């Protein structure tokens, strides 16, 4: 089962850089792309193929495709990792969109160059045999990045019906100049609504809070947000990168979490034990399962008032004791609440620690993370909706950026924005209907 990763935008490129750094340091690859084991004759206890390609000279090539419009930022990853990434997998533009532009120019450029991108992804697909699905990594605030991501997602979903699509979206924190970024994000969401099968979102406020809580002298920690995102994705993909008893595919993971394709919005959580002062707050799996329910550990700043849980799936890595998890689940079934029209959905995915990094092994040291389906996910949507619910009327500085597929045709732009807001309200209504227990 091969997974094909795609990254969009400068933020997506940084996230991919940190992610591949963590993966290489966990699989003992290094900056060159050679084996770090003293003897190559011995067998391994994992499978690197689902994420890396293998050649005759023992060279590991990451099957990642990065998109960009200004090659200045995308060259740093190759300048730090010499010969690791394939230079033919990258794509760069020439005299495209403006700095900080809307999604419109990026979408136009994507529809212009979607042929060569499709040919490249096809020539990268034909390199393997057992192909499972795609992964996308980007943000909704950036214009060109979100446009290219939306175009590629539409192409993938309407060309490949039997392949899974999982997306990672980065959302900006509540600020002043984000009035236009969220304005453009409103329509960028449209593609994630109908095309994405599984998706996770990240907010910058909670990331900065976790950074200020963990790292010293916290001033600006965008790199630490990248580290947290990479750690979350690596802990998610750990259960497939290292074989286990039950879970060996992304579909088996997502089947126990994603209901009918209108509630596939998930919120992640992670133990303060990072993966980059780390020896503290790592007592036991008991305390991990306890503080996994802490709202301060959530990756999105939400409110604590009898939260409604649809599905919960937690993964714990390390040497775990059964009695701790037994008692933890025994009391969490009483503490956590869920709607009465469904059944309790809580799952554990005890995994394996990487037997290739010189870790500090303890008898009870473990780490943990948890994904959940929440109804409070609509709050981050309302935080952007209330902004443009009152400014779109005049549109003085909104129409200047030419937010639309056509130029100066405000009628079609208004039609697109109206239908986007209507489908957003439809998602909100579908969520509140399941929350209100109307079917009961």
């Amino acid at each position: 089962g091969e997974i094909i990763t795609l990254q969009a935008g400068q933020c997506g490129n940084h996230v991919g850089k940190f992610l591949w750094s963590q993966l290489a340091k966990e699989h003992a690859i290094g900056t060159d792309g050679l084996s770090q084991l003293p003897d190559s004759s011995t067998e391994r206890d994992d499978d690197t193929k689902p994420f890396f390609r293998e050649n005759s000279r023992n060279k590991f090539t990451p099957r990642a495709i990065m998109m960009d419009s200004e090659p200045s930022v995308i060259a740093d990853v190759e300048n730090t990792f010499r010969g690791f990434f394939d230079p033919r997998n990258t794509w760069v533009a020439s005299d495209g969109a403006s700095a900080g532009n809307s999604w419109a120019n990026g979408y136009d450029i994507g529809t212009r160059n979607q042929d060569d991108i499709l040919n490249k992804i096809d020539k990268e697909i034909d390199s393997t045999d057992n192909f499972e699905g795609f992964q996308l990594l980007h943000s909704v605030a950036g214009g060109t990045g979100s446009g290219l991501g939306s175009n590629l997602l539409e192409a993938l979903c309407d060309r490949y019906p039997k392949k899974i699509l999982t997306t990672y979206s980065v959302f900006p924190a509540r600020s002043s100049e984000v009035v236009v970024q969220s304005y453009n994000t409103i329509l960028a969401l449209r593609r994630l609504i109908e095309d994405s099968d599984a998706t996770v979102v990240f907010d910058n406020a909670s990331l900065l809070n976790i950074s200020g809580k963990v790292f010293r002298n916290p001033n600006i920690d965008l790199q630490h947000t990248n580290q947290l995102i990479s750690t979350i994705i690596s802990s998610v993909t750990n259960s497939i990168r290292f074989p286990s008893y039950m879970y060996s595919s992304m579909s088996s993971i997502y089947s126990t979490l994603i209901p009918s394709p209108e509630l596939h919005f998930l919120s992640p959580s992670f133990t303060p034990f990072t993966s980059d002062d780390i020896a503290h707050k790592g007592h036991s799996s008991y305390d991990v399962m306890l503080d996994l329910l802490d709202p301060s550990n959530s990756l999105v700043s939400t409110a604590m008032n009898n939260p409604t849980y649809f599905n919960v799936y937690n993964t714990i890595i390390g040497n775990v004791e059964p009695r701790q998890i037994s008692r933890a689940m025994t009391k969490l079934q009483q503490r956590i609440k869920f709607p009465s029209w469904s059944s309790s959905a809580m799952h554990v995915n005890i995994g394996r620690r990487s037997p290739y990094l010189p870790l500090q092994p303890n008898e009870n040291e473990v780490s943990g993370m948890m994904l959940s389906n929440m109804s409070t996910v609509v709050n981050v949507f309302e935080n952007a909706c209330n902004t443009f619910d009152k400014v779109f009327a005049k549109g003085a500085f909104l129409n200047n950026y030419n937010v639309g597929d056509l130029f100066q045709s405000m009628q079609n732009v208004q039609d697109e924005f109206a239908e986007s807001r209507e489908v957003v309200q439809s998602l909100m209504e579908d969520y509140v209907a399941a929350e209100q227990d109307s079917y009961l």
Binding site: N217, N219, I220, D221, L222, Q223
Partner: peptide, 20 residues
């Protein structure tokens, strides 16, 4: 954002000096 990036680089300098 340039000043923010420079101050992140200052964070990295302080960390590497602590390691030194």
């Amino acid at each position: 954002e340039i000043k923010s990036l420079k101050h992140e680089i200052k964070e990295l300098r302080k960390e590497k000096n602590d390691t030194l």
